[PDB]
Amino acid sequence: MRILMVGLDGAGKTTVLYKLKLGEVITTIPTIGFNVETVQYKNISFTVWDVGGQDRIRSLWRHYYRNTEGVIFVVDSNDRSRIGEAREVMQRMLNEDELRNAAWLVFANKQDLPEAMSAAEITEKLGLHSIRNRPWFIQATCATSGEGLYEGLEWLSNS
Template sequence: MGQSYSAAPQVILMGLDSAGKSTLLARLLTGEVMETSPTIGFNVGTLDLDKKTSLTVWDVGGQKCMRPNWRYYLDDCKALVFVVDSSDRARMPEAQKALKKVLSDEKLRGIPLMVLANKKDLAGSMTIREISNQLDLQAHSDRLWEVQACSALRGLGLQQAFFSVNKLIKKS
């Protein structure tokens, strides 16, 4: 994957299976909710933020068997967007371990991180602070990072999150 498809900065969308990555990307690109199935490999699309700014967003499959392949998508990555299901407390330790492993890759040194707390529309979803603590984000003082709540299903917070991702890329 060494060459990029466009001049737009590449953003990698990662997270555990069923976190809502494909739903999120489809909603961003089409404005609609689409039926998705588990991603084998990746989905990619160009997100236009405004007339002059776009991002190429790669949505990479999150099943356990796919995670060893995540490192192959990191070339030319300008920001990592890690999506968590904020209503699934039981899987936060697994998400923390997966995030820590991918961030340890040399290719991501100094690359900004955006954690999207998806499914905020569900009852009992965790707060931003809880997610930040569960993922041990304070340990990543060597990089710019942010956490934002969103709902891919309802389209809430998605545009704002990717404007923030663009700002993080410019700061890094």
């Protein structure tokens, strides 16, 4: 299974990936580029493309769209200023023809932080209810603990 994981910078995309691959919480640098890794979960081998979220790189995601079976969209639940921006990025991503049938999994992340928005709140802000054309799911996660990560891999594998 081919997976594209994106989201704004600092959402926690690489932390998520290497928690999944190494069971370890690594010390990230901003990703100017991608990381690509293969992860085994329950007889599925997920090839995850973690593509950096800062602006220059954001402009490049479209090259990773093609062949994508599922999309992990990571959100920093503690950052309320950038939630609209996330909504804007994700909405036009939903309009992409190469992403047309891909399974849509939102991770509301850093759920560990006291003022993190809830997954329900995030669902309203991102406009997730309005997707009728394909599968979507939202999952509260904490990438450092590992909470919600495998519930994500589970949902994804049931595409």
